[PDB]
Design a binder for this molecule. Structure first.
Ligand SMILES: [K+]
Ligand SMILES: [Mg+2]
Ligand SMILES: [Mg+2]
Ligand SMILES: [Mg+2]
Ligand SMILES: [Mg+2]
Ligand SMILES: [Mg+2]
Ligand SMILES: [Mg+2]
Ligand SMILES: [Mg+2]
Ligand SMILES: [Mg+2]
Ligand SMILES: [Mg+2]
Ligand SMILES: [Mg+2]
Ligand SMILES: [Mg+2]
Ligand SMILES: [Mg+2]
Ligand SMILES: [Mg+2]
Ligand SMILES: [Mg+2]
Ligand SMILES: [Mg+2]
Ligand SMILES: [Mg+2]
Ligand SMILES: [Mg+2]
Ligand SMILES: [Mg+2]
Ligand SMILES: [Mg+2]
Ligand SMILES: [Mg+2]
Ligand SMILES: [Mg+2]
Ligand SMILES: [Mg+2]
Ligand SMILES: [Mg+2]
Ligand SMILES: [Mg+2]
Ligand SMILES: [Mg+2]
Ligand SMILES: [Mg+2]
Ligand SMILES: [Mg+2]
Ligand SMILES: [Mg+2]
Ligand SMILES: [Mg+2]
Ligand SMILES: [Mg+2]
Ligand SMILES: [Mg+2]
Ligand SMILES: [Mg+2]
Ligand SMILES: [Mg+2]
Ligand SMILES: [Mg+2]
Ligand SMILES: [Mg+2]
Ligand SMILES: [Mg+2]
Ligand SMILES: [Mg+2]
Ligand SMILES: [Mg+2]
Ligand SMILES: [Mg+2]
Ligand SMILES: [Mg+2]
Ligand SMILES: [Mg+2]
Ligand SMILES: [Mg+2]
Ligand SMILES: [Mg+2]
Ligand SMILES: [Mg+2]
Ligand SMILES: [Mg+2]
Ligand SMILES: [Mg+2]
Ligand SMILES: [Mg+2]
Ligand SMILES: [Mg+2]
Ligand SMILES: [Mg+2]
Ligand SMILES: [Mg+2]
Ligand SMILES: [Mg+2]
Ligand SMILES: [Mg+2]
Ligand SMILES: [Mg+2]
Ligand SMILES: [Mg+2]
Ligand SMILES: [Mg+2]
Ligand SMILES: [Mg+2]
Ligand SMILES: [Mg+2]
Ligand SMILES: [Mg+2]
Ligand SMILES: [Mg+2]
Ligand SMILES: [Zn+2]
Lengths: 84, 101, 119, 50, 71
RNA sequence: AAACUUUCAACAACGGAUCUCUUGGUUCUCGCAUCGAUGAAGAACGCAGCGAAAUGCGAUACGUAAUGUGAAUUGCAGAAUUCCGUGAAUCAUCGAAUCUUUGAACGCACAUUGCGCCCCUUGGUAUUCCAGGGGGCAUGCCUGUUUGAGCGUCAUUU
RNA sequence: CUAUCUAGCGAAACCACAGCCAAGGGAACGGGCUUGGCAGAAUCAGCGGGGAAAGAAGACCCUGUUGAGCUUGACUCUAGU
RNA sequence: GCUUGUGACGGCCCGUGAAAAUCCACAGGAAGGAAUAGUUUUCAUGCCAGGUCGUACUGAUAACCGCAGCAGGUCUCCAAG
RNA sequence: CGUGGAGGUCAGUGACGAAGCCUAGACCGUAAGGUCGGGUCGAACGGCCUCUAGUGCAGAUCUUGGUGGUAGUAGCAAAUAUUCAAAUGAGAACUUUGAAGACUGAAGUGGGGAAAGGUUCCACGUCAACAGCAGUUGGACGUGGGUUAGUCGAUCCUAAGAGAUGGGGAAGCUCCGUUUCAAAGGCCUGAUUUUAUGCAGGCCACCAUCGAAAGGGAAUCCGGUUAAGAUUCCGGAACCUGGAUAUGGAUUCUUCACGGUAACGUAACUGAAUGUGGAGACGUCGGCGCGAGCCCUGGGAGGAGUUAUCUUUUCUUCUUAAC
RNA sequence: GUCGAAUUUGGGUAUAGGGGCGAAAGACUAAUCGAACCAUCUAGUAGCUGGUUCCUGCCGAAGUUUCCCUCAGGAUAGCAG
RNA sequence: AUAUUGGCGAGAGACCGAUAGCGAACAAGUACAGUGAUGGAAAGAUGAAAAGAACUUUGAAAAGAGAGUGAAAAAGUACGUGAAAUUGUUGAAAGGGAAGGGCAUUUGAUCAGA
C-alpha cells in the first residue's frame, strides 16, 4: 500500500473555498484559510513569499475605486459640475 | 533526541481522561449553614455505576434550605448504604454509616 | 432614440415614476419578444432609458435632500464631499492657521521684511 | 454529491455556462489574435478542484 | 415549458434568484392579473431561477400566455 | 545486375534555425503625493442582439448623468443620415449617480446564499401570527447628553 | 494463452564510432592496433558465450581539516530545578 | 425455512454500554370565573399560511482517487429456486 | 581572423533586389577567414580608421527545442464467447434490430445510495481529434433540453471538540481560558393608559456562538405522468406546525364532568408562578414467542408453453399505501 | 493467518516537525522519515569531479627545496615567459 | 538640502531583440500541478490590401487536379525567410566481417585562368 491503493481513499476535502480569497485554501477543521489567513483581520503575506505577494497585491484586481483616485487627485478633488 | 512518552503525556491530547459516560464529579454537599450548625437529611435515590471508577456512586437528594427545590448530590457510596436510606449531613448528624460528619 | 436627461429634468417626480413604470413594461414586452425574434437590439435603448430615468429621479431626490440640509452642519455622509479619508481628517484652514497670542504679537511686530542689497 | 452547497452549485453553473467553444464571429474581428478557447475545461480531463 | 402551459395550467417564468415564492406569487398577480394556485421553484444548472406558477382553475394559462405574447 | 547501404546534388518533406522586424522588457534621469468605516486592496457571482476570455461595468450592470469634440460604431445584424445638430461614438473628459454578494467587514452566523431583534409602512380580521417594501442593531476609545450605582462621601430634614 | 504469420495499431531501454577470430604487444583480459586466419548481397526463428551489455556520479574501503542520527563526567553551553 | 421488526427472558463485564434541543404529565392553587345566563379552541367541525438551499446522473474492470477509459483502492441498503 | 553595438568616413551597397539561406561551381589567405558566380528571397546592409562588449563551442550524465537508429520491432495474451441474418452507411468483427449460443447467478456483471465528480443525465446533429484495432457507435464533438417539496434532507439540538466576550499573558503577530476574580437579564404585569411605558408593586440565570446530509428530530401516501424530474409534477386521499376564529358539543343552580370496590374509562371536562417526574435516551450475545415481506404449496378463474408418447401438466396474473 | 472482540470500518474530532504518534519496526506523520512538505536566507561553502568557445608566430616548464591541523591543498625557492 | 527595486506622470539609453529582455511583447501570474503553503509554462510575423481561391472536374468525404486572386501561392491562415539533424523521390558512384582519413596517380564528371 501507501501508493496507488492508498490514493483510492482520497475523498475527504481538507480545504474548501475561502470566503475572502476564493482559493479553496480554507482549512475546514482549522477554519482558517492557508492562503489569505481568513478569518484573521490581516491578509496573510510573507516577505519570503515575494511571488505570492505579487500574485495577490494591489493591481491584480480591478481596483474599483483606487483606479479613479488618481484622476480625482489630478483634478484636485473637485466637487461641483462641469457647468457648460 | 526525541520527546519520550511520559513527557508527551503532559500536553493532554490523547492522554486526557475518557469522561463521557461518567456520572459527574463525586462531591460532598457544599459546606453550608445547615451542615455547620445542625444537620440536613437527604435520601439515597440511586446507587449507580460510574464509568472508569471502581466504587459505586450514590445519588442523594437534599432539600434546598433557601429555595423550594431539590438538590441532587453525587456521593461515593459507602458499603451498606442502600436506596431509600436517609443520609444525615452536618455537625449534629448521628454516627451512622453513610452520614457526613 | 431613447429618453434625454435634459427632457426628463423638466418633469415632476410623479411623471418620472409613471414613465419609469412604462419603460419597465416596455422592457418586459421586448424581452418576451426576444425569445421568438432573432437578435432584436431595441432592448438596449429601453434599458438605457430606464437607467436615465432612474438617474434623473435620484438627482431630483438628492437635490431635494441637499436643499433640506442646506446651511446646517451635519449633512448626510453621502452628501458630504468625498475627498480622501486623510484629506477629510486633515485640519481645516481655520485650524492649522490658529496661532497663539504670543506668536501673533511677535509675528506682527517682526514680520519678514522686504529688502534688497544695492551697493 | 447530489446534496451540494449553493456555493458549489453556483460554481458549477458558471463552469457550465463557460463550457463552450469560441464564438465564430470572433475570428472575424479586425485584428483578432484569438484562435480558439484556450481556457476550455472538460470533466474528463481537468478537475475544477471545487 | 410550453407543454406545461398548454396542459397543466402552469406558466413557466425565469425569476430573480433573490425572489422567493411569496414574491413570485404577488408579482405574477400584479403583472398579469391572475390568481396563483401554487408556486414551485428551482435553481437551474445554469444558475438562474425557474418558477412553475400554477394558476387557479379560474384562469387559463394558455390564454394568459397568448396575452403576454408567447404562444 | 537489382534490391539494400553509404555519399553528393535537385526537388519535395520534417523541423523551426537564421535574417529582418518589435504597441514588450530592462536600466537611468526628472517631476508629483493621492488608499480605507463617506467601506479600501482583494474575492465571488453576474451584466452585451449575437462573448468563452482579456478589458469594462454592477440589477441604472462592456454601462447612467455631466462636459468637450463634432459624425460615427463596424465581425455581422440593427439603427441613423435632421445628422447646419443640446448631437453619432466601444471617442475623449469626468466634478453627478448607480455600485449585486462580500471583504478591515459591523445584528448573530457562515463547509448554511442559515438565524434573529428594533422602527416606519403595505396586504392577509391583525399591537402579538405570516408575508412584501423601506430604514436600522459590531467592537475599543474620546468629548458631550441622559439615566443610574456605591454608608466612597458632604450638607440638609431629622 | 502466448511466442509465430497476417491486418490495424505501435512504444522503450540503449547508442563515441561500430560489430568475425588467434596470438602479440598494450593501462599487464582488443571490435579497431601488429602479424596471421580469413572474408560474398539481403535475411527469419531461436539463443543466452561475448559486447569486461543495460539499470545507478560504488551503498563496501580509503580520503575530505564534508555532514548527519545516536551516546557518554569529551569540549563549550542551556531549558528546567 | 430466509430476511427483518418486535416481545418476554437469560449470559457477560475491575466494560454496566451519549448529550441536548424538544414534547407531555403531575404537584401546587395565583387568578378568572353562572342563571331572560355565564365557563371550555387538550372534544368535533370550519378558515388561512408554510419561506430558503439541495433534488439530473455515475457511484465505478469507463462518470471518484490512482498522470489514463489503470486487473489497484473507495462506506452502505435490498437479495429468488 | 570573426561577432553584437558606438563615434568618424567612403556624399559606400540596395526593391533594376539589402540581409539571410542552399550551392563534390570559381578565386585569395599557412590559417582564423575573405571574395565571386548560380539558386532562393524580400528591406535592409557593408569597406576602412577608431570605440565598446552579455564577442567565437564538440564535449560540461550541459540548457531548451527538434530529430533519429532501435523499429513497423517489444508488443496490443488476466476477467469462459461468440455466431447467423437484415437494416444503416462511402465504408460494419465492433452501430441498431432479430435469431442463436453464453455469462454475472441475489455477498450480482441486478436495483439504489454516502463521499467524490459536475452535466458525464436526455434529445437532435455528428466523426477531424479521443475510445493504444475499428467505428456509421460513445461518458467524444456541436447545439439544446432537463433537477418542481409545509411532510425527503439541510436548516434546529447537542457529542468529542471548536471558539469570541469579561479578564489575564505576550514587544507583537496573538496566547490562555469558556463561566471564569464581570454591574453580563428579558418577560410578566400591579399600576400606567400626560405613552400599557420611564418613574414604578412584584417572578426567574452560575451565560455568545460553531460542531452530525449515518446520532437526536413535527408532519405524506398510493396511482399515473417525462426524451430526461418525482415520497417534489398531476389525480385522489392525509397529516403537522404557526395563526385566526365561530358554531355544535361538553360544563355550571352542588360553578371548574361523571362512571368503576379497584386496576382504570371517556369526545370534552379551568389552572399562573414555582417545583417534580416521564419521554427524547441508548451495550452485546444466546435461545424462545409473535408479526411482516419473501420462499414453498392446494383449489378455482384467466393467458401462455409442451403434447410421436406421457403429463387434471410446466410457466405466469389474482394486489391493496399513508391515513 | 484470523474471522464475535485487544474485531473490522465510515464520518466527525484531537495531536504538527526536534514536533506529533508509536502493542516499539526508527515504524508512521499525503509514493517524502535516523527529523515531512513549502518558500526564503541562497548563486550557502567545496583543498573535490566535470566543462571552459578563433587562427598563426616565437619562447617554453614542473612533479624538486623549506614551512604549514601539511600528505588530493597552499606559501616559499627553483624551473618559464 | 537627504532616501525612494512601491504608486502616478514624464524624458531617455554605445541595454535585450521572442531559448534574449521581466515569469509574462500574445485572453500571464494565464493554462496547468499540488490537500495545502506554493509551483508555474508554452505561445509574436500571410499579404499593401482577404484580393482568404468564384467556377469546373474526380472523390462518400477530407481533399486532389484545373481555373482564378495576388508583385509573388517558391505567401493558402498546417501562412515572411525557411538552416541542420532526420526523410522521400530522382540522378551519379562505390560496396567479399564497418565506414571515414593522409600521400600519390589512373579513370569518370566538372571547371577557372590564357
Ligand atoms: K540522519
Ligand atoms: Mg509515506
Ligand atoms: Mg482532517
Ligand atoms: Mg477532559
Ligand atoms: Mg425546491
Ligand atoms: Mg461597495
Ligand atoms: Mg581476439
Ligand atoms: Mg598479454
Ligand atoms: Mg570494445
Ligand atoms: Mg589484418
Ligand atoms: Mg558479409
Ligand atoms: Mg533470451
Ligand atoms: Mg551475453
Ligand atoms: Mg563515485
Ligand atoms: Mg555515490
Ligand atoms: Mg588535510
Ligand atoms: Mg556534526
Ligand atoms: Mg442485517
Ligand atoms: Mg434521482
Ligand atoms: Mg442513481
Ligand atoms: Mg451499483
Ligand atoms: Mg480519473
Ligand atoms: Mg550585445
Ligand atoms: Mg540577395
Ligand atoms: Mg553540402
Ligand atoms: Mg516586407
Ligand atoms: Mg558569453
Ligand atoms: Mg553544440
Ligand atoms: Mg572541448
Ligand atoms: Mg547530452
Ligand atoms: Mg534533449
Ligand atoms: Mg509483434
Ligand atoms: Mg502480454
Ligand atoms: Mg479474456
Ligand atoms: Mg445484437
Ligand atoms: Mg462461474
Ligand atoms: Mg451461470
Ligand atoms: Mg448518454
Ligand atoms: Mg483506435
Ligand atoms: Mg479511426
Ligand atoms: Mg455517415
Ligand atoms: Mg455532449
Ligand atoms: Mg424530515
Ligand atoms: Mg482562544
Ligand atoms: Mg448548529
Ligand atoms: Mg439523522
Ligand atoms: Mg430518475
Ligand atoms: Mg399533490
Ligand atoms: Mg361527560
Ligand atoms: Mg535497529
Ligand atoms: Mg557559481
Ligand atoms: Mg624551443
Ligand atoms: Mg584528482
Ligand atoms: Mg521569454
Ligand atoms: Mg527567432
Ligand atoms: Mg505533496
Ligand atoms: Mg515564424
Ligand atoms: Mg517572393
Ligand atoms: Mg514559410
Ligand atoms: Mg537535410
Ligand atoms: Zn482565503
Amino acid at each position: 500500500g501507501k501508493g496507488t491503493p492508498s490514493f483510492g481513499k482520497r475523498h475527504n476535502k481538507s480545504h474548501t473555498l475561502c470566503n475572502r480569497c476564493g482559493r479553496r485554501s480554507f482549512h475546514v477543521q482549522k477554519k482558517t484559510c492557508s492562503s489569505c489567513g481568513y478569518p484573521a483581520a490581516k491578509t496573510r503575506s510573507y516577505n519570503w513569499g515575494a511571488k505570492a505577494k505579487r500574485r495577490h497585491t494591489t493591481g491584480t484586481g480591478r481596483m474599483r475605486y483606487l483606479k479613479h483616485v488618481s484622476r480625482r487627485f489630478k483634478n484636485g478633488f473637485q466637487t461641483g459640475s462641469a457647468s457648460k | 533526541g526525541r520527546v519520550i512518552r511520559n513527557q508527551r503525556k503532559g500536553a493532554g491530547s490523547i492522554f486526557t481522561s475518557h469522561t463521557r459516560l461518567r456520572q459527574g464529579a463525586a462531591k460532598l454537599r457544599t459546606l453550608d449553614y445547615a451542615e455547620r450548625h445542625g444537620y440536613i437529611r437527604g435520601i439515597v435515590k440511586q446507587i449507580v455505576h460510574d464509568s472508569g471508577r471502581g466504587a459505586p456512586l450514590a445519588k442523594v437528594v437534599f432539600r434546598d434550605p433557601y429555595k423550594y427545590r431539590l438538590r441532587e448530590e453525587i456521593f461515593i457510596a459507602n458499603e451498606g448504604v442502600h436506596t431509600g436510606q436517609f443520609i444525615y449531613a452536618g455537625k449534629k448528624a448521628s454516627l451512622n454509616v453513610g452520614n457526613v460528619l | 432614440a431613447g429618453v434625454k436627461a435634459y427632457e426628463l429634468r423638466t418633469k415632476s417626480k410623479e411623471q418620472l415614476a409613471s414613465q419609469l413604470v412604462d419603460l419597465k413594461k416596455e422592457l418586459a414586452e421586448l424581452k418576451v419578444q426576444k425569445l421568438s425574434r432573432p437578435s432584436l437590439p431595441k432592448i438596449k435603448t429601453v434599458r438605457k432609458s430606464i437607467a436615465c430615468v432612474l438617474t434623473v429621479i435620484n438627482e431630483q431626490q438628492r437635490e431635494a435632500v441637499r436643499q433640506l440640509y442646506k446651511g446646517k452642519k451635519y449633512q448626510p455622509k453621502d452628501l458630504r464631499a468625498k475627498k480622501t479619508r486623510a484629506l477629510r481628517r486633515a485640519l481645516t484652514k481655520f485650524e492649522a492657521s490658529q496661532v497663539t497670542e504670543k506668536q501673533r504679537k511677535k509675528q506682527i511686530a517682526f514680520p519678514q521684511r522686504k529688502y534688497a542689497i544695492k551697493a | 454529491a447530489a446534496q451540494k452547497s449553493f456555493r458549489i452549485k453556483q460554481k458549477m453553473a458558471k463552469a457550465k455556462k463557460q463550457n463552450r467553444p469560441l464564438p465564430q464571429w470572433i475570428r472575424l474581428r479586425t485584428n483578432n489574435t484569438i484562435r480558439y478557447n484556450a481556457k476550455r475545461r472538460n470533466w474528463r480531463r481537468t478537475k475544477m478542484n471545487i | 415549458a410550453m407543454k406545461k402551459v398548454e396542459d397543466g395550467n402552469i406558466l413557466v417564468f425565469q425569476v430573480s434568484m433573490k425572489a422567493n415564492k411569496y414574491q413570485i406569487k404577488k408579482a405574477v398577480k400584479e403583472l398579469y392579473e391572475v390568481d396563483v394556485l401554487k408556486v414551485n421553484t428551482l435553481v437551474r444548472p445554469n444558475g438562474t431561477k425557474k418558477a412553475y406558477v400554477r394558476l387557479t382553475a379560474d384562469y387559463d394559462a394558455l390564454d394568459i400566455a397568448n396575452r403576454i405574447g408567447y404562444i
